[PDB]
Design an enzyme around this catalytic site. Structure first.
Site, short mmCIF file in Angstrom:
data_model
loop_
_atom_site.label_atom_id
_atom_site.label_comp_id
_atom_site.label_asym_id
_atom_site.label_seq_id
_atom_site.Cartn_x
_atom_site.Cartn_y
_atom_site.Cartn_z
N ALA A 1 -30.21 15.37 42.01
CA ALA A 1 -29.19 14.65 41.25
C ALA A 1 -27.81 15.33 41.37
CB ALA A 1 -29.58 14.57 39.80
N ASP B 1 -28.80 25.16 38.67
CA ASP B 1 -29.25 23.78 38.48
C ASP B 1 -29.29 22.99 39.79
OD1 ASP B 1 -30.46 21.89 36.83
OD2 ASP B 1 -28.58 21.12 35.99
#
Ligand SMILES: CN1CCC(n2cc(Nc3nc(NC4(C)CC4)c4c(=O)n(C)ccc4n3)cn2)CC1
Length: 281
Positions: A144, A140
């Protein structure tokens, strides 16, 4: 061995997990995967407390990866709490939030210079290199999940999905960053490289990986616009920078282009990405 915090101590230092923003006088700083990150103060240290909301395996994976992986470009887990169903992770607070928020200048923060963006890119590559050297696929990698400390040092975060180095039925990750084969169920460190290429484009352009009121909506699609000579990298460079020189911007775009190759085997390994990012400066 991390610090075992009591649930009531974490509840107490976060004003009972106050859901109001810091700006209003609350404790909510933002939200990750399946959790809300709150600000707190434990033993004269500003901390970030992530309250998770099975998901217990993602909590244990975060602790297991952090127990093994300690590097300057990875977040620092201080401790955790698991009283019953409400799971918490305590980290050293990152004063400059996420790379995503800083690129968007959220809450009025000033734009990151080109010089600082280069440092962040090299830092994030060093963090991914440490994960890959220690046989872990992040799964991931996104802006962010790249936090920035009190000196703008890049810190890779969110290892709840991380796997120890192949197919899977439960496909996880953020669609706008995922590699084609990751979206199909493959688990490979080459997918992390593709996602890093999207982060490099975000750093160069200042544009989010996905924007529904934009053409193209997916940032990775600009690679094709540039290759088909419809647009140039100059057309997409973040205008909120006064120190970006064309040579280094094109050097970083060349790395992003290599990372975003559709064939997983054509992409460079993280040591090569790390080598190219150091050559750039
Ligand atoms: C204007 N000014 C407002 C405050 C800002 N700020 C400071 C932080 N600290 C922060 N945030 C985190 N996550 C996010 C981004 C909230 C969702 C994390 C995090 O996820 N972990 C794992 C560890 C530490 C940590 N520390 C966030 N925003 C900076 C700009």
């Amino acid at each position: 061995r991390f610090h075992s915090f009591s649930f009531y101590e974490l509840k107490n230092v976060t004003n009972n997990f106050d859901e109001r923003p810091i700006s209003v006088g609350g404790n909510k700083m933002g939200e990750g995967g399946f959790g809300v990150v709150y600000k707190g103060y434990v033993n004269n240290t500003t901390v970030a407390v992530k309250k998770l909301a099975e998901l217990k395996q993602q909590f244990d994976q975060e602790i297991k990866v952090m127990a093994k992986c300690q590097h300057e470009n990875l977040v620092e887990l201080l401790g955790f709490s698991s009283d019953g169903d409400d799971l918490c992770l305590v980290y050293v607070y990152m004063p400059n939030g996420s790379l995503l928020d800083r690129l968007s200048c959220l809450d009025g923060t000033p734009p990151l210079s080109w010089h600082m963006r280069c440092k962040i890119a090299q830092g994030a590559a060093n963090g991914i290199n440490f994960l890959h050297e220690n046989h872990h696929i992040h799964r991931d990698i996104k802006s962010a999940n790249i936090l920035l400390d009190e000196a703008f040092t890049a810190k890779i975060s969110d290892f709840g999905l991380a796997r120890a180095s192949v197919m899977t039925s439960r496909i996880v990750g953020t669609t706008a960053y995922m590699a084609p084969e990751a979206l199909r169920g493959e688990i490979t460190p080459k997918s992390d490289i593709y996602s890093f290429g999207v982060v490099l484009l975000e750093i160069i352009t200042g544009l989010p990986a996905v924007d529904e009121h934009r053409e193209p909506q997916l940032l990775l699609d600009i690679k094709e616009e540039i290759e088909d000579e419809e647009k140039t990298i100059e057309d997409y460079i973040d205008k909120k920078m006064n120190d970006a020189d064309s040579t280094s911007v094109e050097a970083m775009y060349s790395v992003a282009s290599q990372c975003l190759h559709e064939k997983k085997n054509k992409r460079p390994d993280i040591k090569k990405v790390q080598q190219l990012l150091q050559e750039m400066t």
